[PDB]
Amino acid sequence: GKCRGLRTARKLRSHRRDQKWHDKQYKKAHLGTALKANPFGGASHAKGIVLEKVGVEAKQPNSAIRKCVRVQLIKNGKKITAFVPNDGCLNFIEENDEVLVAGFGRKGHAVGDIPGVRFKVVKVANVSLLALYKGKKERPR
Amino acid sequence: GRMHAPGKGLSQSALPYRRSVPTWLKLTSDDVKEQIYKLAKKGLTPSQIGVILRDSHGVAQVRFVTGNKILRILKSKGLAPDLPEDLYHLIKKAVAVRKHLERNRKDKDAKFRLILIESRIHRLARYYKTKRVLPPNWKYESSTASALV
Amino acid sequence: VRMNVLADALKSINNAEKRGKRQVLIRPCSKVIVRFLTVMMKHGYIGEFEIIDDHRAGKIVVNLTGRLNKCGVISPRFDVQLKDLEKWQNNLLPSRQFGFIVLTTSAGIMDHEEARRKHTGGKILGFFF
RNA sequence: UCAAAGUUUGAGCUC
RNA sequence: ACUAUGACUCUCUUAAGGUAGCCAAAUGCCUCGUCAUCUAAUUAGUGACGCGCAUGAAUGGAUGAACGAGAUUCCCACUG
RNA sequence: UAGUCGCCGUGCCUACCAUGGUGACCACGGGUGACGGGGAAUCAGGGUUCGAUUCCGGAGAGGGAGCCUGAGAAACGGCUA
RNA sequence: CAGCCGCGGUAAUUCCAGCUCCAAUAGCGUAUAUUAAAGUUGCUGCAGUUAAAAAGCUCGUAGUUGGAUCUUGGGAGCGGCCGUCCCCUGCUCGGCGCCGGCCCGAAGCGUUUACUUUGAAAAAAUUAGAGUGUUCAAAGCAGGCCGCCUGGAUACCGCAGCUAGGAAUAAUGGAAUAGGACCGCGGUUCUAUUUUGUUGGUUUUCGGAACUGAGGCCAUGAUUAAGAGGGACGGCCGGGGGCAUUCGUAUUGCGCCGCUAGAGGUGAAAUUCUUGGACCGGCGCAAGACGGACCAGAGCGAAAGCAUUUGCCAAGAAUGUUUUCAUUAAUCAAGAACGAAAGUCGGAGGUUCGAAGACGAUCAGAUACCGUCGUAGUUCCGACCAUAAACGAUGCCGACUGGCGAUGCGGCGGCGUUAUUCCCAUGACCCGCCGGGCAGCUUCCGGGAAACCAAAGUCUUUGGGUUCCGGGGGGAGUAUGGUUGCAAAGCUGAAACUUAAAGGAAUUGACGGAAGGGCACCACCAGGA
RNA sequence: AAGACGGUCGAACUUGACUAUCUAGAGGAAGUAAAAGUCGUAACAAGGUUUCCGUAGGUGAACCUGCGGAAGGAUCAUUA
Ligand SMILES: [Mg+2]
Ligand SMILES: [Mg+2]
Ligand SMILES: [Mg+2]
Ligand SMILES: [Mg+2]
Ligand SMILES: [Mg+2]
Ligand SMILES: [Mg+2]
Ligand SMILES: [Mg+2]
Ligand SMILES: [Mg+2]
Ligand SMILES: [Mg+2]
Ligand SMILES: [Mg+2]
Ligand SMILES: [Mg+2]
Ligand SMILES: [Mg+2]
Ligand SMILES: [Mg+2]
Ligand SMILES: [Mg+2]
Ligand SMILES: [Mg+2]
Ligand SMILES: [Mg+2]
Ligand SMILES: [Mg+2]
Ligand SMILES: [Mg+2]
Ligand SMILES: [Mg+2]
Ligand SMILES: [Mg+2]
Ligand SMILES: [Mg+2]
Ligand SMILES: [Mg+2]
Ligand SMILES: [Mg+2]
Ligand SMILES: [Mg+2]
Ligand SMILES: [Mg+2]
Ligand SMILES: [Mg+2]
Ligand SMILES: [Mg+2]
Ligand SMILES: [Mg+2]
Ligand SMILES: [Mg+2]
Ligand SMILES: [Mg+2]
Ligand SMILES: [Mg+2]
Ligand SMILES: [Mg+2]
Ligand SMILES: [Mg+2]
Ligand SMILES: [Mg+2]
Ligand SMILES: [Mg+2]
Ligand SMILES: [Mg+2]
Ligand SMILES: [Mg+2]
Ligand SMILES: [Mg+2]
Ligand SMILES: [Mg+2]
Ligand SMILES: [Mg+2]
Ligand SMILES: [Mg+2]
Ligand SMILES: [Mg+2]
Ligand SMILES: [Mg+2]
Ligand SMILES: [Mg+2]
């Protein structure tokens, strides 16, 4: 503070109330455009259909072909590049199957090589992708 | 520092500690008042009075030699002006400014000084309104002002 | 304009004590200041000051010793409940053993420990240690 | 007692 | 460094070689140009596109409120 | 001001007069992913966010409206649109 | 794989396996909202010369803050010079009762807030918390002795409201044309009511409201005049402002006279002017710019800025002052005045230069740098405009803490020189002191990331007052909206998306078509195959 | 009782105005992210015409010139 007056409570509080908005994160929390724009709409997971398999190329120093997958959500209809992680797990993901998608730990921010891919697959057809990779369970056919 | 200027001059009178009268001075308060009456009748301010007294009669301050002050004595005898002399001198100054501008419309500096002068006037005017010497309806109005000196 | 007489004086003395100056002249004499000095003096932190009476706001000459680390002020004058006295004296002082917070009260000008004895809250003026 | 002077494998430098 | 195109360069011809802006308009043959809207349905009409047979700068170009016994298109109410 | 209604006080309603009231001390208007509170989480001291939710108060039973019956209802596990 | 840095290009401590080893253990992992960590929203507690940052300047009502000054002390007894217990209102009915008076008790009245302390009052549940062997505990409020014995408490519980104590700090009134207090005197008008043994009525006496005459007494009534401020006065001071007036050369142009063939211009040339007389020189005339040199690390102005002579108009900082008033003051959203150049609209004027434009030159290209021309503009008056690195890139007031010399103004003092000449009192020198002023130097004052600063100091020993304004880079001062302007454009002012870095000071290199030094026939110089 | 005149409340439908919120939309025009193109080389060393600021006009692009500022410049000094 600078006005250390005994009766400037109002003037102070007002000033604070104006400047909280210049903080980028508060504005992020309280204006709705971010929450609405986010397809997750303040959610951890979201279900969606696989419609095509895509090999997105990595950024520099690194060099790799990341295996992503174009899902279309049911509730909104928005389109997402959900990335499948680990080794040999893509042969499992068949086309036209429901997968539960989650975030990527960054709250609206791209991560490393995969440019603009904030989402990863957890399940396939009520079957944990982990269980398929480990070999505990099998795909129902 | 000064109000409408950057100067910060430290020059004024400095009265000494002894409030006592000197030994050589033997002119009474009554005689001084009879002089006051003549000078006020002839037409003169408390300032110019105080000046003459200190210069010729060698009596620096009446407040110190006698008990009460010069203006309150004049107020007792009904010589006080309708409004205070400083406002009198300001409006007279104001008028001369607006007069010189009347021919000389360009003098922008004169306009700036005029405006500051009027601000200073209304400041004094609110002090005197609180001191209950002017009526609530008093108002400097360049239209009516020139009637007042 | 000059608002706080005390606020100017106490800075002047702290800028003397940092330089180890021996005696200090302060230009406006206030009654509250005078009470303040007498409080520190009875408790032995400084010697015998003397005040120069002009039919005016007086002056004051303090013969300074060397035991005073700081003598500070709190503007604005905050009210202080007995609840807050501990948090004030905690956050405002070097330790729990020494140092003082002097607050004038209805009762009178006195230390905070004397306020604790007398059961008397009040308006914080300042502090020293 | 003032005209100008451009570039350099993709094929691997470094605590 | 996809094709296309051609920022860039040269040359032939003339004294240069259509800059800014605009359109299938009262100016476009092929032509009902193509796409969208307006209709149940529209060779008309309106808004973008331009390769402009043959746009174009006081032979003036573009806009633009008010006015018109001016030219077309649609809508309301209304009617032998 | 005088009445009406109403169990009384009051633009509650009616009639006749007067022309007032609020506003940078943020009204007015718009938003609120707001029923409120008692409380919870977090913490050095200051504070920050949450609190539909077993206790209290409010409102509501498809949408709005209207009413009989009753000490008590503008009731919805009572009626009429 | 890896939240991030990074790993993987043939001995991979980073992948897939095996072999081991670590953390936690009936639990652990992942995601999202959210909280401490965050002195990265800061009241306690941030920044604002250079890393992001102070409105171009000043005026201005609300807002916020405001100098000093009025009660200090006193009596009796007490403890180890000192401390503490006891006390520091005033103005109809009965007893500590005592010989009508005195005191006390009671009723009513008290110039007023903030501030502080008490109590009551607060729904429980919850929290903390006393007790209590659920076999411990989580829980519960129960239980225990062999008929009896006990518990079933307590605290916190904002803010506002009430209740009685305290009166330092901050307001606030009061007696100043005295229609001023006390306590008294007498009228005018109106009546509470008591009264004359008993039937009826009134005024008085005696009490209670308004009005009205003249007293006695009151120490009779007015805080000081701020190193707060305004206003006055004296002679000065200053490129301070405006208007009008005067002068100078040079300039380019013209007219005339003189000799004459080139003149121009460049690194080198041409278009250009020129035997219809150029350039050069002389004398006259002409119009508009500009007032050099004197001109300083000088002055004044709110700021841009302000310099030919003379005249008129008014102002002001600063100084001396035993001049008047006595708080009249500081900073400020809203609102307002001024505000270089370019730009714009009308006239007036159109000398020079010169955006645009053309051509001539170099050049791989140059629609530029060079040249010859040359338009708007550049000048004045009248209308708009409000933007610059408008930089000290440093908001305003106020205080304090080191020197040193120089300087500008006003003022003061002091041998002597030197003009007035013939002294005084002035002028020029000379040596000092004082106020504030533009700057300078200086140091282990201390601060600061450092560069640096007697301020960018008086900061974890953090609060003198008050405005404005910044919170990762970009996207973007864009969009959309609003407002102003003839237009140009100004002002207010978002988001999506992307991205892990962007910057400052200073060190060592390397480079330099920057300078200073020094050397070498694989450099030059002088030359040779 | 059936029933009717009238008052009051008034659901409901029809229309308009303002107002909030979401949203399709031919074609156009920006920003950002990968690249080992094409044209040049402004800037950082006087970057080979010092750099930058405000404002006007111009040009394929980076840029050029005019007028007046600033030094964050290649000068803290240049001599009665
Ligand atoms: Mg001011
Ligand atoms: Mg060159
Ligand atoms: Mg190469
Ligand atoms: Mg068409
Ligand atoms: Mg054309
Ligand atoms: Mg024609
Ligand atoms: Mg033609
Ligand atoms: Mg034609
Ligand atoms: Mg049209
Ligand atoms: Mg509670
Ligand atoms: Mg309830
Ligand atoms: Mg309630
Ligand atoms: Mg209900
Ligand atoms: Mg119902
Ligand atoms: Mg049922
Ligand atoms: Mg029910
Ligand atoms: Mg391994
Ligand atoms: Mg913390
Ligand atoms: Mg936080
Ligand atoms: Mg910078
Ligand atoms: Mg900066
Ligand atoms: Mg400024
Ligand atoms: Mg600035
Ligand atoms: Mg004070
Ligand atoms: Mg001249
Ligand atoms: Mg300037
Ligand atoms: Mg403002
Ligand atoms: Mg101008
Ligand atoms: Mg101009
Ligand atoms: Mg014009
Ligand atoms: Mg030229
Ligand atoms: Mg050419
Ligand atoms: Mg040229
Ligand atoms: Mg600027
Ligand atoms: Mg600080
Ligand atoms: Mg940013
Ligand atoms: Mg990156
Ligand atoms: Mg060699
Ligand atoms: Mg040699
Ligand atoms: Mg260049
Ligand atoms: Mg050069
Ligand atoms: Mg350059
Ligand atoms: Mg540079
Ligand atoms: Mg050109």
Swiss-Prot record, chain A:
Record PTM N6-succinyllysine, positions in chain: K53
Chief localisation class: cytoplasm
CDD domains according to UniProt: Ribosomal_S23
PROSITE patterns registered for this protein in UniProt: RIBOSOMAL_S12
SUPFAM superfamilies reported in the protein's UniProt record: Nucleic acid-binding proteins
Oligomeric form and interacting partners: Component of the 40S small ribosomal subunit. Part of the small subunit (SSU) processome, composed of more than 70 proteins and the RNA chaperone small nucleolar RNA (snoRNA) U3.
Name of the molecule in the record: Small ribosomal subunit protein uS12
Organism of derivation: Oryctolagus cuniculus
Lineage: Eukaryota, Metazoa, Chordata, Craniata, Vertebrata
Gene symbol of the encoding locus: RPS23
